[PDB]
């Protein structure tokens, strides 16, 4: 046992683990939209580049939990990274509505976290998810939420025209 | 069928594929290296930081290959990232090592790869798997092994004073 | 024979003549594209300096050949520059697509070239396509493909509102 | 017919062609000049420069009329580039000799081209060749005689100590 | 057997050590040619100063050929430098004569060191010839035989003065 | 017989001769001994810097020589360089000691060349040594005699440790 665990339970230790899981997962998610985008057959710099971000923040999150695991006394145990369950994202809009599916579902993943934090009695893991994840979270959801609702009614995905300037005004 | 694809075969198609997959696991893997390194009963900052940087690379190296994948009209096909083989890494030698085995094995699958672009005479991806990750290759297993020969002449593992200097004195 | 002709076939000397005279025909090609989106009828300023870039671009290819036919030793011999068979580019999009056509043809003249050097076995000749002509064809086709597939998607060329904006955001 | 026409002639509108197929002409026997210089049994760099500046601005002449041919509201319509009479340049003075017969011609096409204007009460046309064209000339055969005055009163092409120094004095 | 040696065969190294000597070698000429120039009845600043310049370069050669040895865990065995076989270098045209054809010879061994590394299956050996000495050679040979041709043109070695000049106006 | 050559004895001039090549001898040594530890099993790069800084300056003597011989009217006469006699130099303490036998070994030729000076009555060649050779070699056994005391209180070839840290903290 750790010589700086305290009031650090078992089963919010294994939890992090699962997180940290979830976390990458969402990464190699936006990883396989962002280049999809990069085809020479849908060319749309700015849909990769705004994917390619995400991804990117993705890495850092499933860091910081890395981080979390050894400052409370417990041992990270990793897992396989599942691929995305789809190769091709079809359209612009069709890639901005999972990835409002996706994170939405990690945020339920963060608020059962944060829900088990408070069970345990375990107020620092419970501010430490409040301060860095649960907010950022809102954040996004309620920005692809606005993404989604754009290209709806700019007449996407059957207008090619609409996903084109989206590309351009909005994420250039 | 693509339009920009010329000169681009199927089997030149597929082995980058996979390449894509082993680049992902061997930066999986760094991160797997980089926070053990964090651990409160380890506590190596500049090992952590230096697993944690390769990570970063082998990353950005799958995302150079996943672009021309599309240059050559070719298409993605993700696969599952691979946890590695180990939670713990022992100590700081046994990292330095278990790297130096991974990217002689990734140079293996690289110079298979350039051959099979030989003998399908793609002198193109020939002349850019040469000039963006052959020679990076080198560089890396002769980093490598250049710490390990270190270490061991310093008593690495057996001597924690050992490893501790050469987090400060080489790698910081 | 030169002084300082050394591993340089009889072979290699008359196919970088016949390349050199391809890359000036490109250039012309290039040419007539810019100033037909010059004409008052036609008006896309901007599509007729992408192309003027092209052009110029590809009498700097042809006179980095002339450069080395004169370094191994060798004697430039030029020939006529056909005009492009069409005096009219019709559209944005017909003008793109003929340019993807264009470059997928030199293309596999470089890539013949590099076969007859590696036969000769000259490696240097092999490094010299390899390093300044390979991969620079290789991005402007996938340059070229990601263009047709925006103005297509747009609705190129039966709504002229396409190609204006792709004139204005794309390539303004 | 263009909507921007205005007295401007059909027998001017075809005249307008024909130079700029002979200005790029001119190009491309100043380029064919300029690496015959850079020849490893001719090695005289400046020359080989002087000849590639006349090559782009003979580029840059031709290009201004076909703005300016899309700018009355004609049409443009290119020929054949035919190939210099010459693959071997003989010598320094040789090419200057040359040079000056060319231009000489190129002059005459201008003030025929001016003349033609006239019978035809174009006087915009005509102030443009004017302005732009017909005093440029001027200057470029007279400095081309003065460097063919000078290279034969060195002892040119007898003497290759004089073009050498001529190479490094005047176009250096 | 070395730790990090991987597709190294015996051959290759074996071969770069008699490069290495080679490179050595060089240097050791243009060095003996370099002070000859200095001498009080020769008493040319400017040769003497190109070949000792030519001299460290040789030597910066020899040096990365030794760095390439042990990056890829082959071992550096040396040899004695055979002294140049003139103590006098005549003429300063008799010696860009001989440098020339000491460069061809240098080449030569290249082209047959690339030779070997492709029977092998090297393709990093390769291309780090490639990148980092084919294409130096062939400039190297270009400017010396430029260097060949402007002094014979000139009177070069009979006349004393033109020998002069070129220190000046050439190598200055 | 030159025309500059004044009180300079012709036992002088060789014995100048004698001593260039074995300048070059001791910077052939310290180019042994440098890339020695460049290699991945010894891996001592400040070690290997050191020494490379210590073979381009008796480049540097050796060049000052030879400038001596042609300012008095001496001719230059170079020989074979023989290789250093281990192409292993075991350690670092083995390397510097053996750099401070050589370093003697060229002191005691200085020392010659001073005497033969004297008995010659060439005050100019004495003060010459005197100044740019005699102080230098004093200097530099001083300096190897100080990391050779270092190294072995230290523990040195037998801690691993020692050398390691003398490579970090004294020579770098």
Same mark, same amino acid.
């Given at each position: 046992?750790?010589? #700086?665990?305290?009031?650090?339970?078992?089963?919010?230790?294994?939890?992090?683990?699962?997180?940290?899981?979830?976390?990458?997962?969402?990464?190699?998610?936006?990883?396989?939209?962002?280049?999809?985008?990069?085809?020479?057959? #849908?060319?749309?710099?700015?849909?990769?580049?705004?994917?390619?971000?995400?991804?990117?923040?993705?890495?850092?999150?499933?860091?910081?939990?890395?981080?979390?695991?050894?400052?409370?006394?417990?041992?990270?145990?990793?897992?396989?990274?599942?691929?995305?369950?789809?190769?091709?994202?079809?359209?612009?809009?069709?890639?901005?509505?999972?990835?409002?599916?996706?994170?939405?579902?990690?945020?339920?993943?963060?608020?059962?976290?944060?829900?088990?934090?408070?069970?345990?009695?375990?107020?620092?893991?419970?501010?430490?998810?409040?301060?860095?994840?649960?907010?950022?979270? #809102?954040?996004?959801?309620?920005?692809?939420?606005?993404? #989604?609702?754009?290209?709806?009614?700019?007449?996407?995905?059957?207008?090619?025209?609409?996903?084109?300037?989206?590309?351009?005004?909005?994420?250039?």
């Amino acid at each position: 046992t750790s010589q #700086v665990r305290q009031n650090y339970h078992q089963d919010s230790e294994a939890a992090i683990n699962r997180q940290i899981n979830l976390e990458l997962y969402a990464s190699y998610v936006y990883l396989s939209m962002s280049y999809y985008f990069d085809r020479d057959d #849908v060319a749309l710099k700015n849909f990769a580049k705004y994917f390619l971000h995400q991804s990117h923040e993705e890495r850092e999150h499933a860091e910081k939990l890395m981080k979390l695991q050894n400052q409370r006394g417990g041992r990270i145990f990793l897992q396989d990274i599942q691929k995305p369950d789809c190769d091709d994202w079809e359209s612009g809009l069709n890639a901005m509505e999972c990835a409002l599916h996706l994170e939405k579902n990690v945020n339920q993943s963060l608020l059962e976290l944060h829900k088990l934090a408070t069970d345990k009695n375990d107020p620092h893991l419970c501010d430490f998810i409040e301060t860095h994840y649960l907010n950022e979270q #809102v954040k996004a959801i309620k920005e692809l939420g606005d993404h #989604v609702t754009n290209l709806r009614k700019m007449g996407a995905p059957e207008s090619g025209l609409a996903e084109y300037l989206f590309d351009k005004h909005t994420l250039g």
